[PDB]
Amino acid sequence: RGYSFSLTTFSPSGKLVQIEYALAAVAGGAPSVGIKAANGVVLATEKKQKSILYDERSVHKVEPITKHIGLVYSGMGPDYRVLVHRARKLAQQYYLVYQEPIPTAQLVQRVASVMQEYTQSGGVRPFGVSLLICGWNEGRPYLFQSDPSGAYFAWKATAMGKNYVNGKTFLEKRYNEDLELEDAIHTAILTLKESFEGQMTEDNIEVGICNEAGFRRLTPTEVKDYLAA
Amino acid sequence: SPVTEDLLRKGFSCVKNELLPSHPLELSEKNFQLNQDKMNFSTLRNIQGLFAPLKLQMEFKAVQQVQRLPFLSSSNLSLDVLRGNDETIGFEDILNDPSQSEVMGEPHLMVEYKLGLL
Amino acid sequence: QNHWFTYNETMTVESVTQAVSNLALQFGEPGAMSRPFGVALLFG
Amino acid sequence: MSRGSSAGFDRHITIFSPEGRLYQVEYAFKAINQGGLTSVAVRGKDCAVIVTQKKVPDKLLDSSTVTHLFKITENIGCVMTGMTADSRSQVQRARYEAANWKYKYGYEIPVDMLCKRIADIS
Amino acid sequence: IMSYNGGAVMAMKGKNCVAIAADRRFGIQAQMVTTDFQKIFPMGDRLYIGLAGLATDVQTVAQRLKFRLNLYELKEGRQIKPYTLMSMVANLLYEKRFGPYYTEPVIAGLDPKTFKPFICSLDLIGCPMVTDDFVVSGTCAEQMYGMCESLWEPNMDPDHLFETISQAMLNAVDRDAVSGMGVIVHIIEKDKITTRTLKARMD
Amino acid sequence: AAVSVYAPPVGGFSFDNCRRNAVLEADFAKRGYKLPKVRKTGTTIAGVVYKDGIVLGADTRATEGMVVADKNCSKIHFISPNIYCCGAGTAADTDMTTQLISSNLELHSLSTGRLPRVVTANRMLKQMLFRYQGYIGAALVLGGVDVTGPHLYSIYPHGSTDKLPYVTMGSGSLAAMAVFEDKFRPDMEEEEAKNLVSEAIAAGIFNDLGSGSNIDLCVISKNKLDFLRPYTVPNKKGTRLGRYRCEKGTTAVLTEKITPLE
Amino acid sequence: YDRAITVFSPDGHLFQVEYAQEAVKKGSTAVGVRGRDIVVLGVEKKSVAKLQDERTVRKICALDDNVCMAFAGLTADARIVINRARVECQSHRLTVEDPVTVEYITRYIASLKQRYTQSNGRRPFGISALIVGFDFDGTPRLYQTDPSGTYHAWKANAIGRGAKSVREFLEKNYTDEAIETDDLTIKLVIKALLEVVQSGGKNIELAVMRRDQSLKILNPEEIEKYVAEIEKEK
Amino acid sequence: MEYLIGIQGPDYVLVASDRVAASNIVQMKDDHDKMFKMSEKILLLCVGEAGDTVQFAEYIQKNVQLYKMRNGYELSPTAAANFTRRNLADCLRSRTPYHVNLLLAGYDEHEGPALYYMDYLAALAKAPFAAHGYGAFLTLSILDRYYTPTISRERAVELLRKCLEELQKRFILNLPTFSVRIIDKNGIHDLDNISFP
Amino acid sequence: RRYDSRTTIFSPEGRLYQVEYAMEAIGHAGTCLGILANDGVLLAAERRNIHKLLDEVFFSEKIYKLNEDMACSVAGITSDANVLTNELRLIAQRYLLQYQEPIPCEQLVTALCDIKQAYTQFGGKRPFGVSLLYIGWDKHYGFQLYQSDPSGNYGGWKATCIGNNSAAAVSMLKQDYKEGEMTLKSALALAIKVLNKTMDVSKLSAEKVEIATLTRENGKTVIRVLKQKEVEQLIKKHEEEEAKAERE
């Protein structure tokens, strides 16, 4: 198709081939699950570092921002660190002025705009990545998901990533609101178990909660305790 | 020192005091990124060779021309990690942030000036 | 007219044909042109 | 640039595949084996020994200027593998970045920051 | 330089009530050209600002602050907390620290959620500070601390608050050539705003 | 929008006032009019290095000339979990020039996963202050414990730096630092260090005009961060003898408007 | 050999200009004729669209108290050109205290059009103008721009789709007698425009301009009255 | 130096002036209209430093016609004032040590007349009767003494005549004759010049 | 034809094919009403996202608020509307900073259409895919409504319908509009009837529509969004009226 191969041209039906291709690419990645509960939120994901040659420290997925915002990627590894650094810089830029921490929504809008800015231009590829971010403001929990083109949604139980349709179908019959983190973590673990190609181990889960204390990331032994329980 | 060899579009600026600098922190604030880049380029050209400044500056030129049109705010997500100011927040973004510009020009005029046609 | 103002004398036809041809020579790669001037003149 | 980007699903970096794979970077991964080398680095508990391989194409070439083990800082090394013409530039870039960091923060860099800076600028 | 014009503003924190008052006069040094010149701006609903100093910069800073406040209010959705405007004006003034403005703003209002009275102040170039009992700034700064320190009292009802803010200004601002001839009193209780105009010596 | 704009606006410190400011100042200097002033809060700051951690402290008076503008103004800021600074003179500038470095160090700490080191803060402050050659004055006392050991610094408003075991900067500082010179000994204890710094700051507050009211201390020991405010009240205001409150109807009224909100 | 402005053909025939002309020859028509002391600038409205309001959609734009404007083609480019012409007129009046002549402003518009034909990164402005107005010396003037770079001091020409028929009708009837009084010019222009349009009065707009009385559009009642008067042919 | 006054009323913004020129010790011309016209309902008086006044007035006058010609309708006096003040402030602080005084006028169709006083540092008041120049000192008290809150158009001319007679009798300079213009809801009316033999 | 690879080339017949193709993008968005009445200016909407795992957000997802009176509704690629609405807010606030009056409609619609068109003349950037519908009040022309276009062809429409199934909705609106005499309640009833006539006929609910009004009263223009329970009774009344068709 001649109308493809370039993101600046519309196909003669109304679409953008490159954007859909990038969406399929980020779909073809690593599964991730996010659950919103009346008390807090939980973000669960697994890593490809299965072999013992790798290390638990150093490289890490769920990088916190400030104290109330935490994210997780489900796309290309070397293609979200720059985005994360930009998000932290934007949070600090907002913090120097308006001497009070960033609310989630403004950060979502700004990161969505900066991500979209590499769509309308010509000659640079869109970011292949799609990331959830969780916040806790005004005594309320917030969950959002970002798309390669950039369109935030007020999602509640998204299981986007590899084989995300099965995760969505499984989650559409378990979540019922009015839950604490104790059951939410188990639900997320079950959702990951539904499609993992193997058994969960002590060094394959990177759950991180965002209760009304901050963005504590669960220690490996604590994850072992929950996995056993 | 130039002679004439539209005043409504650009007017009300006497020749008297642009060749008379203001408060001495004028040439060190109006042109800061350019001076820092020039100093770094000179240092690299002196100590490492002639390849590094040419390569780095032409990389700057290559990455500069993919932003949005001038009459809209530029994200500038790239060119920043390459410049080295990836996390060096300072008195350049919290004071008079260009996103909330108090005055704004015409789109066609600004883009045609950016192209240098005028 | 600029030459008259500068040197305070009249033009010589070669001295203006040279100038106009030099201007028209700029075809190629700044309000620079991009196509040859599809025109022709008979200076007299 | 007045030459354009070659049309094709795998002929340029900024074009995604129909399934969503960057074929140019995969070709880049395949390109390391073109030169032909092997490097092994093992860390124990108090040492960080690095071993590599050296091949002399002929006899006339000197044996002292063909090393593939450069030095970045006073106490950091590298075992660069692949095309020499690009490692010879990444080494200089890393040296400049290390010097800049030492000037801006006044202590020797942890390995993670140098690795991250190189990864980002790549 | 805050003598080319005139101005004086107070702020007292009572019991769920805040009061802000100013002086109406605009004149070129000795001469006087008008008697009505507002120096109190209705930013928000239960919030107010009290710019006082050189007028030609008062107008500009008020316009810019109103613009930025509208932008933030529209973008972020809900109203602005009183503490945020403090850093707002601090940033706006430090924007031109080297080319300084000439304003000594006073901010006084209520929290839209807690209804806890709040009062702050600012210097010429922006240096945030909060005083619990009261604050005052203006051209006639010296001849108000003495009047206010003794007359003040904690935990005051609105009526006594109005009486005190009237007595700390009406006979304390006439002891100066410039910045006289009229006093506006703004009392901001919990539910309804109320404005009053006193009468003073016409000299 | 506008019809006389070519280039996009550029942020940073604006300078479109000095041309008018100079001529206005020349006009108003010879006519004996009022002159602008800033909160030149000349305050005493003290710091000592005892056996385990560091102790800081400063007075809490903020003047703007010959009039006491404030009676309670914190002279101790927050930079990191285990680094504190102090300000002296032109508090408006020192607040921002400390907050900026605090945010930069927070970004660095978030990107590194480990606690920052004091030398980084010193380097950044030195670079910024020397970049703005003069025209911005904020004498600082930077102290904090790190992974190596206790540290202390004495940044000047031109870029100079030192590594003294004790330092006293500000308008009124000679009294406190002379008390230090007389009483200080190496390798003291915690409570003794607190008593010594309190005594020095008390001498400085009494024997000077630019300082007054309460004092505070900022013990930042290795595994315990403390922030005591206020620590001691040396002076207490008396009481008003006669009631001078005015009753209802005391003041007149000309016009009145009532508007109900919701 | 037609994929870039800068390139030519083996014979010549700069093709992007010709394609722009073809695009211009697709919009609503437009006419104009000068008299003793009068100018008319009638146009025709392609669709009624009673839900739409005729106030916003219009073609007869004002450029000055002595110069008016009527275009044909893509709307946005014409609006941009009119804005630039207004700004240039005001700037020239500021720099010289003299009301601008028609020729100067029409030359400026032609130059602005021609500037966007010198690099294969900017498409040309595809529109056609009918600049007409009164000079400072009182002599009636009329012009007509062209997408490429050209302009002619026409007398009673026309543009838009189906312009050959109306041009022939105008040239077969234009005489000094028909330009003597005021309403005779209106009768002539209405008779000219009545050809291409299906039914008159419904979607025909005029703009009568007199000596320094400024532009004055005509309400539908006057148009209906003029059509009724011109319907007395025998 | 010069002289500018303007008195308000129920439905008029009557303004006077001083048709005169300036030089070292010489009067170049005895009739120099200072009254630039903005629109059919707005005047703009301007006295200041030579050259800068006629330049700034010209620039600010070939900018209000643009708005009318680009939007069909016409500005309002309040918008005109809040625009002129902004332009004056931005331009004066930019690079030029200007010295210009202005006195706007105008009559809209919703709230009576409107007269605005502006100094040379770009302030903005709404006084009911202001003055400029040096004659302000000697004439503002006379204007304030007889100024009933409501003044008929007939009596406004008489009040102006008295206020100008006092200035012509007690002033150092030789302002020989004055111009008078009154604005109503019919355009820009004109009155016969005030000339003292 | 082959003359559509780049958005800078004409056609032998004469047409910009790229913008014509982009015109079809707004054909895959929810419908948008917005008929004009005598007093208020009603503005309906449509929420495509009707999934069971979406949390509510303030001010719906389509209706916005520009400065104090004017709203907008978007359609098409939503990833390019958050920039236009932000820049339009900025231009309105900038005009207010310049002149201290509420902005008229033209100095906003034309201002945004300028940028929207300018991205169609400097090839190297794809044009915005949007169909912004405007609304507002002023003191110069009363109440009026405008409808935009990706190329930029804004017209002072009195009642229109952008998005999918626009042809049938527009035609039936044209055939059933009481021009001249029009009330807010009757306008709302007509809007409900139009929405029921269009769409896949799912009988609608409070979880599929959004309604905004512009009632001006007490000299202070206000914008209000009807509550979730404020439309169920309206739908019930419309259903009762439809069922009360008698016949035989």
Curated annotation (Swiss-Prot), chain A:
Modified residues (Phosphoserine): S4, S11, S13
UniProt keywords, alphabetically: Acetylation, Cytoplasm, Nucleus, Phosphoprotein, Proteasome
GO CC, any one term: proteasome core complex
Primary localisation category: cytoplasm
BP GO terms, sorted: proteasome-mediated ubiquitin-dependent protein catabolic process; response to virus
Induction description: Down-regulated by antioxidants BO-653 and probucol. Down-regulated in response to enterovirus 71 (EV71) infection (at protein level).
Localization terms from the record: Cytoplasm; Nucleus
PROSITE patterns, A to Z: PROTEASOME_ALPHA_1, PROTEASOME_ALPHA_2
Phosphotyrosine modifications at: Y3, Y21, Y73, Y118
Modified residues (N6-acetyllysine): K67, K168
Record keyword Cytoplasm present: yes
A Pfam match: Proteasome_A_N
Function: Component of the 20S core proteasome complex involved in the proteolytic degradation of most intracellular proteins. This complex plays numerous essential roles within the cell by associating with different regulatory particles. Associated with two 19S regulatory particles, forms the 26S proteasome and thus participates in the ATP-dependent degradation of ubiquitinated proteins.
Subunit structure: The 26S proteasome consists of a 20S proteasome core and two 19S regulatory subunits. The 20S proteasome core is a barrel-shaped complex made of 28 subunits that are arranged in four stacked rings. The two outer rings are each formed by seven alpha subunits, and the two inner rings are formed by seven beta subunits. The proteolytic activity is exerted by three beta-subunits PSMB5, PSMB6 and PSMB7.
Similarity remark: Belongs to the peptidase T1A family.
From Swiss-Prot, chain C:
Tissues in which the UniProt entry reports expression: Expressed in fetal brain (at protein level).
Induction remark: Up-regulated in colon cancer cell lines. Up-regulated in fetal Down syndrome (DS) brain (at protein level). May be the target of the transcriptional activator NFE2L2.
Subcellular localization: Cytoplasm; Nucleus
Family, per entry: Belongs to the peptidase T1A family.
Complexes and interactors: The 26S proteasome consists of a 20S proteasome core and two 19S regulatory subunits. The 20S proteasome core is a barrel-shaped complex made of 28 subunits that are arranged in four stacked rings. The two outer rings are each formed by seven alpha subunits, and the two inner rings are formed by seven beta subunits. The proteolytic activity is exerted by three beta-subunits PSMB5, PSMB6 and PSMB7. PSMA5 interacts directly with the PSMG1-PSMG2 heterodimer which promotes 20S proteasome assembly.
Described function: Component of the 20S core proteasome complex involved in the proteolytic degradation of most intracellular proteins. This complex plays numerous essential roles within the cell by associating with different regulatory particles. Associated with two 19S regulatory particles, forms the 26S proteasome and thus participates in the ATP-dependent degradation of ubiquitinated proteins.
Protein name, as recorded: Proteasome subunit alpha type-5
Gene: PSMA5
Curated annotation (Swiss-Prot), chain D:
The species this protein was found in: Homo sapiens
Residues bearing carbohydrate: S5
Protein name in the entry: Proteasome subunit alpha type-6
Phosphoserine PTM positions: S17, S63, S64
Subunit structure: The 26S proteasome consists of a 20S proteasome core and two 19S regulatory subunits. The 20S proteasome core is a barrel-shaped complex made of 28 subunits that are arranged in four stacked rings. The two outer rings are each formed by seven alpha subunits, and the two inner rings are formed by seven beta subunits. The proteolytic activity is exerted by three beta-subunits PSMB5, PSMB6 and PSMB7. Interacts with ALKBH4.
Protein purpose: Component of the 20S core proteasome complex involved in the proteolytic degradation of most intracellular proteins. This complex plays numerous essential roles within the cell by associating with different regulatory particles. Associated with two 19S regulatory particles, forms the 26S proteasome and thus participates in the ATP-dependent degradation of ubiquitinated proteins.
Entry-annotated residues carrying N6-acetyllysine: K102, K104
Family statement drawn from the similarity comment of this UniProt entry: Belongs to the peptidase T1A family.
Disulfide bond positions: none
Record's subcellular location: Cytoplasm; Nucleus
Portion of the parent chain present: 1 to 122 of 246
Swiss-Prot record, chain E:
Annotated compartments: Cytoplasm; Nucleus
Nucleus in keyword set: yes
Gene3D superfamilies on file: Glutamine Phosphoribosylpyrophosphate, subunit 1, domain 1
Residues annotated with N6-acetyllysine modification: K75
Induction context: Up-regulated in asthenozoospermic sperm.
Main location, first listed in the record: cytoplasm
Single Gene Ontology BP annotation: proteasome-mediated ubiquitin-dependent protein catabolic process
Family matches, as SUPFAM superfamilies: N-terminal nucleophile aminohydrolases (Ntn hydrolases)
GO cellular component terms given for this protein: cytoplasm; cytosol; extracellular exosome; nucleoplasm; nucleus; proteasome complex; proteasome core complex; proteasome core complex, beta-subunit complex
Presence of the UniProt keyword Cytoplasm in the record: yes
Keywords tagged on the record: Acetylation, Cytoplasm, Host-virus interaction, Nucleus, Proteasome
Family the entry assigns: Belongs to the peptidase T1B family.
Job description of the protein: Non-catalytic component of the 20S core proteasome complex involved in the proteolytic degradation of most intracellular proteins. This complex plays numerous essential roles within the cell by associating with different regulatory particles. Associated with two 19S regulatory particles, forms the 26S proteasome and thus participates in the ATP-dependent degradation of ubiquitinated proteins.
Protein name: Proteasome subunit beta type-3
Phylogenetic placement of the source organism: Eukaryota, Metazoa, Chordata, Craniata, Vertebrata
UniProt gene name: PSMB3
